[PDB]
Write an enzyme that holds these catalytic residues in place. Structure first.
Site, PDB file in Angstrom:
ATOM      1  N   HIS A 263       0.804  -1.217   0.000  1.00  0.00           N
ATOM      2  CA  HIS A 263       0.000   0.000   0.000  1.00  0.00           C
ATOM      3  C   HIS A 263       0.841   1.272   0.000  1.00  0.00           C
ATOM      4  CE1 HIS A 263      -3.889  -2.064   0.801  1.00  0.00           C
ATOM      5  NE2 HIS A 263      -3.112  -2.945   1.404  1.00  0.00           N
ATOM      6  N   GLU A 303      -6.474  -3.681  -3.939  1.00  0.00           N
ATOM      7  CA  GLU A 303      -5.886  -4.909  -3.419  1.00  0.00           C
ATOM      8  C   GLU A 303      -5.375  -5.822  -4.531  1.00  0.00           C
ATOM      9  OE1 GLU A 303      -6.170  -4.221  -0.315  1.00  0.00           O
ATOM     10  OE2 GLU A 303      -4.990  -5.842   0.576  1.00  0.00           O
ATOM     11  N   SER A 322       2.522  -7.641  -2.624  1.00  0.00           N
ATOM     12  CA  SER A 322       2.940  -8.183  -1.337  1.00  0.00           C
ATOM     13  C   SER A 322       2.817  -9.703  -1.296  1.00  0.00           C
ATOM     14  CB  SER A 322       2.132  -7.551  -0.201  1.00  0.00           C
ATOM     15  OG  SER A 322       0.743  -7.766  -0.380  1.00  0.00           O
TER      16      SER A 322
HETATM   17 FE   LIG Z   1      -4.561  -4.441   2.037  1.00  0.00          FE
END
Ligand SMILES: [Fe+3]
Ligand SMILES: [Fe+3]
Ligand SMILES: [Fe+3]
Ligand SMILES: [Fe+3]
Lengths: 420, 424, 423, 421
Positions: A263, A303, A322
């Protein structure tokens, strides 16, 4: 399955949104309506209207301890005075708008609403006591305070280094241009190294310098309504703990590896900051049916979202940047790709555990922002919203006179644009 | 002839900032940081941030001063010849071929907030009042940006001075002050303690202004230069004092005291239309030459300090020197002094005095009309760039000719979109 | 493939687009520059610039008769006078922009460029001789003239009634909201009845009142470049004949049943009028590679396009609303549906004879217009175009002129909005 | 003695009902039946789709005073039963009714024959008097869309034109605005603006249509202020076709062909000026009589007798100055007073039509003056705003908030193009 409905406390939250035209004794008679009903004169904050020069804006900080006197006050404000009153309620009863923070300081009232068996590290006494340490720090955090700096153990820096090295060796060819443009700055000024875990305070000051984004440490997963509401103020509620070292490539909850590597880099881009903020503005006062729809849009964009970049497709979602496994998967021939269209994205079914069989490819961060804005116009709420970065408060728009002020503001800015 | 314009002086260290962008290339960002790293310059003095318009460019904030003059000439040459970037050199001493220094971030107002240039002052032979001026000055000298304003308990003798000025001026606000002033003042009495027997705290007032227009209060020991004081308005930061005038002469103050700041400037600062007008004057001063800093101080004198504004078919007062002076407030709204329409083409060159009353006042049509004139006047100020304040990051964006249109186009596009969803 | 490449005549068409700053003797020496080469003083039209108060805009009506002397004139305008000159050419030679009409009156030059074996009614002398009647009317039609009213026979109204009855009983459940919104008005004011064939003049006057769209009778099929170019002026080149009565549900060429029942009703909607106009503006001066791609986009949108309407999908294409067979097919489970994305729609393969196995579903007429405009920005041309309905002419805009004409347009539109919000 | 001419009504008059209708099951049928059941023809009630709301219909009712009895019942039913916003236009201007104004460019023909010959120059000339009847018949029989009939001017008339043309031409370079001296050379080459030739209105009308879309409609004389300004909203300039008498070549009590072609036509070819004159016309649509005169006063001190800045100098752009040799040399001198154009008191300024103007208003630019008229239009009491649609040549009457949402989306599209440019 990523939508989390909002819960209410024992006190809850009740806010009365109403304006008042300045008249002889007008401000006095409104304070009298609350003072004569045993409501403190500190819960009733009065401020001038930031659009109408002749109106006052009232900020009522109430809860469930005012239910009996509320019906009498609202009736007098609507019948006698004759003002447009919007009743905010946390419990979301009928004929009431769901509560939402109007100021950036109002994010503290529901920052402690957080949701063991097969979790990694459940049988680790050193790791368990450390999770209670990070949770207590977040429970005591108030707005304005500096993010507490926590010393990380050597074993935790190894977990960060494993996730950092694998993802960094894939960012050049798989991440979007914005990610590879911001990431070198994070390595030099925030300490985004393989052998170092950056501090949230160093990252929060960096995000404030780029897009004004702020980080608020939270103990776990907030509700979808509360998490989106922070985006309207450009406040990103994030965690401070790290995942367990036994399985460095799995985390049922967003950990510091997901927040700082997924993020944070995109949040430093202004075009992306406006997109994430526009989603938060749509959530302010939105019904539960549309909070879930906004959480689904958040899932397939912020996301797990893809973006066009010339004749190629790159990844900008945080769940992809991620996760080493799904990052190689998103830019392959296995999943299906569809153009980002929120008319059916908000009703798209998905899962949080396994990979995404279908991804939505956005045209640009600006294009995705405009789609969220158009989608927000269908959200049933008796008003529109606008964020004021000078005062860090939300402007509630309902009157046609306010639009007259906004129309003349645009007209003045266009006149400056003509002179070139 | 004795004006309110104060020329800015430079310290022994000064302040130097290099404004330059950099297109992202292989090793481009690394070689620029090395250009400062190989000259023993800390990686905190050279702040690099992404460009808020060009997705492929970086924006650099260099915090240097005169202690880097020998190595500065070599660095600028490499950025222009080797790297090949457009570099604008800000300098406090205002040497030739350099743009006059101005703060780029809201935190940079601390560098020159304590540089101030006892004889005929009322209470000169009062050691208690003199020692108390040393107390308020030390508070301002030790104040840094972000810190809360220290709350000072005022004596009964000081409340007598405040009560005399407060009661007399309040009896004239209804018929002489503008609508904006009389709209904010009732809120200040209830939430800031604007009472006759109480002097409000600057911290309580600063928190109130932040909620209305985002305006902040910066405690200063005295009168800053016109360049430094106006530069704070670009960040919506109002440099003000904390002491009160002496009680021997309750209707006289040679310097702006807490009675002048809280009753003259603070109420109008809570109005958004007035906050934008004062901010545009501050933005015009950023990097402006000395000839135009004085001209902006003259415009500031005939508007924010001693300005009149139309209100229907009547004329009210909005200047701070009028709303904080019982004598001149009754004088400004009479037929004795001359009145001229506010037009900055000849308003900026009008001569005035600070001691005696103003023989001429300028009557504005509205705060919005005056705002457009200040921005129009700013377009003539010789500067190789334009300026814009970003409230999200609290920093000034340096815009060239091309970046001017992209900023406004993106701003209009957002404002129109919000108007669509409001029209339903 | 519905793309028809444009052909050139023996004379062709050549237009020089250039501006001129007003100076001492500037306007006189430019008119003299053409006069001294025996070029008529009526083909060189000079007009003031609609942006720069100090400039003149020139409309040159030339052709291949000036090819030898053109190279000398262009050099003086670029070297001596020093003006930016872009040479339009019908033959599309190198260093020249493909020709396109700049005024609504210039649609008459190539309105006779039209593309008998297996046609229905080939062995019918009455039907063949009637095709000579409608073709001759179109060959003699000039801009500004009223469309000649032709009385249709009873045998033709029977053919019209068969197509009208089947489509009308299916429009309510298959056509988009815009189609079912205009059709009741067309039945009352244009005579859209089962026993009556509407006149083009009565229909053209209706379209001018709704969206300013005009009908120009043409003898047959124009080239893709010429047909799309008419959309930039909101002019719909259409035919006037009717299909043969032997096969009421087949027509190898666009007939009066296809134009009046497929294209006309949607053309009365403003949101669709802007979409069809945006496609036409993209074709003005576009290369041949993009004329076919624009014809392909036109095929999967205006001709055979679907649009979402809530959680359902309706049909707005003209080939669907004028064919009873394919209208039931488009909103069925047989074909495959894909979201409208011009990145592969312009390269999408189709056929003109058989039904379409795949349809593109647009989000809205406004959404489709923005996609065409974004695609138009990639078309290689040294200028942009904008239609001026006041003068009915195309404005040639470059990078500097676009910013001023758009900002002035936004300034005017915002200004009136400020007063309307003030009641 | 002002230039404001009040509008009169005929025995039939004109009545138009402005109302929209949302499309529902039987909605369109119940409205047409509401007029059919009251013996109102289905051709006087023209229905068209709304040019903004995709779900609404727009109705154009062409009625007059011969439908008054059934009108009160229909208007009540449209407001109570159906529940639609109805605006009643009436020529007689009764109370609770908006003054009539043309909604389409074709509606300018109904009152184009309303014209208000004793001490006029050439009263004892039978040839000139009978020629005035000739030009009046051409205007009386002219309908919109028809080409302007070309009239050949006599040699004696070309001499009158040449006297006014030569004197004014020797002053245009130094006294006329830049826009006038920029358009005038084009008029000399393509319209025949010569000393020995009088241009035809058809050749001039086609020139104005190519530049700014302005059209010329021949009228027999002076129309009312409401009817003349209403034509500017459609960019239609009602003008005369006759020439002044040859005895006094520098005097004309009525606007003649010398005033129209030399005063109004050249500046009308400028797009920035065409929008200014159109903005005044849009403000007049439905304006009360008190504000029609105020708009006529603004028109007098701007389009007719207006000055404009041009650098550090002042030039003339009014038509009454560029068509008068005497007042053109006088206006740019130190004798008359000059004041900045401010409509707050300009509309209430008193003036005279015979003698020279003792006071002139100096505008900053055509773009700045247009915004002032639009600001003045916001104070004109009318229950709606107006917008001209050049595609359909019809006026859009805006009342609802949904129409503004659609206009805001239109603005949003143009802004998006400007961002990606
Ligand atoms: Fe998240
Ligand atoms: Fe002051
Ligand atoms: Fe077709
Ligand atoms: Fe006139």
């Amino acid at each position: 399955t990523s939508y989390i409905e909002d819960n209410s406390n024992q006190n809850g939250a009740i806010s009365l949104i109403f304006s008042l035209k300045e008249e002889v004794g007008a401000l006095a008679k409104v304070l009298r309506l609350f003072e004569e009903n045993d409501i403190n004169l500190t819960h009733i904050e009065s401020r001038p209207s930031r659009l109408n020069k002749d109106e006052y804006e009232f900020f009522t900080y109430l809860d469930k301890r005012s239910k009996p006197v509320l019906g009498s006050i609202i009736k007098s404000l609507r019948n006698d005075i004759g003002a447009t009153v919007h009743e905010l309620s946390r419990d979301k009863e009928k004929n009431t708008v769901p509560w939402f923070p109007r100021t950036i300081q109002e994010l503290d009232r529901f920052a402690n609403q957080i949701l063991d068996a097969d979790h990694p590290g459940f049988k680790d006494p050193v790791y368990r006591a450390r999770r209670k340490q990070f949770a207590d720090i977040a429970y005591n955090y108030r707005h304005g305070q500096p993010i507490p700096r926590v010393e990380y153990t050597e074993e935790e820096k190894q977990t960060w280094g494993t996730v950092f090295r694998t993802l960094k060796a894939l960012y050049k060819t798989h991440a979007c241009y914005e990610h590879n443009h911001i990431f070198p700055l994070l390595e030099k000024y925030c300490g985004f190294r393989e052998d170092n875990i950056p501090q949230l305070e160093d990252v929060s000051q960096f995000l404030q310098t780029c897009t004004g984004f702020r980080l608020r440490p939270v103990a776990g997963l907030l509700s979808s309504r509360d998490f989106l509401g922070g985006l309207a103020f450009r406040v990103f509620h994030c965690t401070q703990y790290i995942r367990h070292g036994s399985k460095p490539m799995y985390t049922p909850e967003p950990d510091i590896c997901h927040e700082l590597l997924g993020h944070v880099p995109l949040f430093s881009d202004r075009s992306f900051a406006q997109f994430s903020q526009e989603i938060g503005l749509a959530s302010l006062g939105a019904p539960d049916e549309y909070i879930e729809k906004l959480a689904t849009i958040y899932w397939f964009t912020v996301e797990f979202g893809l973006c066009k970049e010339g004749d190629s497709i790159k990844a900008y979602g945080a769940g992809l940047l991620s996760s080493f496994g799904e990052l190689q998967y998103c830019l392959s021939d296995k999943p299906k790709l569809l153009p980002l269209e929120l008319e059916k994205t908000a009703c798209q079914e998905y899962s949080v555990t396994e990979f995404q069989p279908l991804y939505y490819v956005a045209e640009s961060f600006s294009d995705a922002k405009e789609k969220v804005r158009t989608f927000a116009a269908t959200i049933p709420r008796p008003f529109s919203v606008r964020y004021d970065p000078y005062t860090q408060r939300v402007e509630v728009l309902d009157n046609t006179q306010q639009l007259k002020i906004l129309a003349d503001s645009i007209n003045s800015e266009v006149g400056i644009l003509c002179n070139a």
